[PDB]
Design a protein around this ligand. Structure first.
Ligand SMILES: [Ca+2]
Ligand SMILES: [Ca+2]
Ligand SMILES: [Ca+2]
Ligand SMILES: [Zn+2]
Ligand SMILES: [Zn+2]
Length: 165
């Protein structure tokens, strides 16, 4: 049996609040590129909103932060998201007790965002260590990063593929 999927292809997101670890512009870029990774291999279209309320709310929070799952300080769980649904549904939370970066020190925001957004869209983990949904964090360069076949197969078993033209 499968978890719930989004039942719409236009999905909005809003950045709740910004970590202080990085330039604001880099936060915006990383989340954006991360939605884009999944846009690239489905029909889904994501758009940022600054006011109102959105499907996927992106949050930086430490400790207990108001849902069913408290963060565990620095290290441990880096972040978590919730599968498609209303409300908390689809949201992504990043543990402020990490140090989020654009590089291979601390924890790389773009690559964790890709993994959390995977969950946002309905994916679970992968047993393939090449998949971005593998539950262990490893750095790879952003220019070079690609989804695995396994990641691709799982997202597209959910939303199908693109779609021209
Ligand atoms: Ca939501
Ligand atoms: Ca943690
Ligand atoms: Ca931090
Ligand atoms: Zn949370
Ligand atoms: Zn995960």
């Amino acid at each position: 049996m499968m978890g719930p999927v989004w039942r719409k292809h236009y999905i909005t997101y809003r950045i709740n609040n910004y970590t202080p670890d990085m330039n604001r512009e880099d936060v915006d870029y990383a989340i954006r590129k991360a939605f884009q990774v999944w846009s690239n291999v489905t029909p889904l279209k994501f758009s940022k909103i600054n006011t109102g309320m959105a499907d996927i709310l992106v949050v930086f929070a430490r400790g207990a932060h108001g849902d069913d799952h408290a963060f565990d300080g620095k290290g441990g769980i880096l972040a978590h998201a919730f599968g498609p649904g209303s409300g908390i549904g689809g949201d992504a939370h990043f543990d402020e007790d990490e140090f989020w970066t654009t590089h291979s020190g601390g924890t790389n925001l773009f690559l964790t965002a890709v993994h959390e957004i995977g969950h946002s869209l309905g994916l679970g983990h992968s047993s393939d260590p090449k998949a971005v949904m593998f539950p262990t964090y490893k750095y790879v360069d952003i220019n070079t990063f690609r989804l695995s076949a396994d990641d691709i197969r799982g997202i597209q078993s959910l939303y199908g593929d693109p779609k021209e033209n």
